[PDB]
Ligand binder design. Structure first.
Ligand SMILES: C/C1=C\[C@H](C)C[C@H](C)OC(=O)C[C@H](c2ccc(O)cc2)NC(=O)[C@@H](Cc2c(Br)[nH]c3ccccc23)N(C)C(=O)[C@H](C)NC(=O)[C@@H](C)C1
Ligand SMILES: Nc1ncnc2c1ncn2[C@@H]1O[C@H](COP(=O)(O)OP(=O)(O)O)[C@@H](O)[C@H]1O
Ligand SMILES: [Mg+2]
Lengths: 371, 72
């Protein structure tokens, strides 16, 4: 029986069968409730919506994300999203299939305990495992050595790996995010006179960030260029058909990843945390980490983030030592593709947590087996 | 491409890339020279295996006869 492979996050849910080439169900991970008084009678009013439904209705709804910063922060909505994933959107009963679940490293243990408890008790999944996102990115990109940098909505984290061994002391985690880039985009957009207050407006800001932002190769030169000229300035069409024009700001937004001081944090940007993570590795491997940098997750999709990273690391790293950045176009899905590869492997079939082992040991078993 | 009829640009493009697609989006992805060679050899093996199955289907077309087979 093909195991399910499910990758949760803040932002999109990605789920599908192991051994597939690409995920079968992808939908933004939102639970929505109506906030207006239903006037019509016999409408079929519904307690709450999940996924694409909550996106379509969203003008009527309060949208709540049940995962902030890779932590599940209300378990009822998350359990609704799993219910929708197995029954509505894959249409396959969980009692048939092992399941593989995905988490950001250095999360609280209770998140794994509750997630396994809900899988065994509430869905009766015959076996389950929890993988690290960064590890799975290496399976997807076809390597056994490298420093992974993976940034989605919520968590950003670097995990160095060398010939299949992690280096826990060198793991870095940061809470820069697609989401904090979105809140920064709203707060800067206010400058030009446009105010996006409600959550359904935030979804518009998110779509502006996807379509129009790009990482400036050199920041101050493009700031001067945008001050001098309209040529950089580009415009977008809100759902109601009004147009808005956004300028230098569209490059200003994704640089905060490089300079968190804009949003107000002090911890250095993803380039300098990548370098500092390599430096926390022992001196013999470092050449191979510089030879492989693997990007993952949607927040690394910005045009020019690969070249800006390669340049700024090369500026940090000793001049002889070859720096390479590996940004595959698929990388938004590569954590799922890696989970598919892993779940397909025959050796892994040994390594599932089984329901009997859960009944014997209780939900704490996950810490013992998984990592 | 001349022998097969397929247009040169399409073979030259597809031999050096593969296509992923989710239902909503599709990515054209480059592949290593080793993977290109493995794919070319897999295409040759697949053509030959189907040509063999076809020639056997025609031999069967000559060998069959219409009366219903009671036992063999
Ligand atoms: C359709 C949208 C925007 C607009 C109608 C699109 C047009 C195109 O924007 C403009 O350029 C016009 C104008 C404007 C006025 C003077 C000016 O020197 C520059 C711009 N600014 C406005 O009408 C502001 C004024 C404002 C309120 Br109150 N508090 C705010 C807090 C911060 C900033 C500004 C404001 N305003 C009412 C809005 O944004 C409303 C709330 N916005 C929306 O519903 C969303 C869905 C986007
Ligand atoms: N092409 C793109 N450019 C910039 N940001 C993007 C792009 N595509 C998606 N994003 C943003 O990245 C985040 C989703 O990241 P992703 O890793 O897919 O989420 P998850 O952590 O759930 O897998 C969202 O903030 C989304 O708006
Ligand atoms: Mg992710």
């Amino acid at each position: 029986t093909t195991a399910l492979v499910c990758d949760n996050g803040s932002g999109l849910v990605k789920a599908g069968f192991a051994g597939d080439d690409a995920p079968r169900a992808v939908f933004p991970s939102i639970v929505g409730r109506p906030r207006h008084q239903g006037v019509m009678v016999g409408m079929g009013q519904k307690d709450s919506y999940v996924g694409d439904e909550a996106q379509s209705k969203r003008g009527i709804l309060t949208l709540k994300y049940p995962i902030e910063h890779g932590i599940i922060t209300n378990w009822d909505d998350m359990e609704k999203i799993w219910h929708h994933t197995f029954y509505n959107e894959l249409r396959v009963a969980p009692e048939e299939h092992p399941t593989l679940l995905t988490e950001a490293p250095l999360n609280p243990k209770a998140n794994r305990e509750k997630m396994t408890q809900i899988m065994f008790e509430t869905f009766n999944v015959p076996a389950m495992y929890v993988a690290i996102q960064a590890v799975l990115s290496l399976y997807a990109s076809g390597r056994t050595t490298g420093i992974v940098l993976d940034s989605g909505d919520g968590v950003t984290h670097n995990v160095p790996i060398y010939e299949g061994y992690a280096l826990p002391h060198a793991i870095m985690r940061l809470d820069l995010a697609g989401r904090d880039l979105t809140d920064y985009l709203m707060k800067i957009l206010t400058e030009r006179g446009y105010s996006f207050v409600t959550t359904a407006e935030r979804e518009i800001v998110r779509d502006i960030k996807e379509k129009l932002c790009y990482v400036a190769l050199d920041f101050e030169n493009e700031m001067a260029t945008a001050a001098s000229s309209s040529s950089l300035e580009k415009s977008y069409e809100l759902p109601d058909g009004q147009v808005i024009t956004i300028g230098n700001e569209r490059f200003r937004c994704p640089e905060t990843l490089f300079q968190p001081s804009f949003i107000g944090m002090e911890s250095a940007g993803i380039h300098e945390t990548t370098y500092n993570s390599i430096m926390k590795c022992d001196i013999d491997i470092r050449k191979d980490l510089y030879a492989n940098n693997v990007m993952s997750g949607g927040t690394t999709m910005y045009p020019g983030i690969a070249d800006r990273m390669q340049k700024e690391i090369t500026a940090l790293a000793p001049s002889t030592m070859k720096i390479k950045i590996i940004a595959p176009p698929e990388r938004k899905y590569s954590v799922w593709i890696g989970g598919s590869i892993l779940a397909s492997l025959s050796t892994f079939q040994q390594m599932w947590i089984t329901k009997q082992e859960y009944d014997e040991a209780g939900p704490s078993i996950v810490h013992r087996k998984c990592f | 491409c001349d022998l097969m009829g397929v247009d040169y640009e399409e073979m030259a493009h597809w031999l050096c890339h593969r296509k992923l697609a989710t239902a909503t989006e599709t990515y054209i992805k480059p592949i290593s020279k080793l993977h290109a060679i493995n794919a070319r050899d897999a295409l040759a093996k697949h053509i030959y295996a189907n040509l063999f199955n076809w020639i056997v289907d025609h031999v069967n077309k000559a060998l069959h006869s219409t009366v219903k087979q009671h036992s063999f």
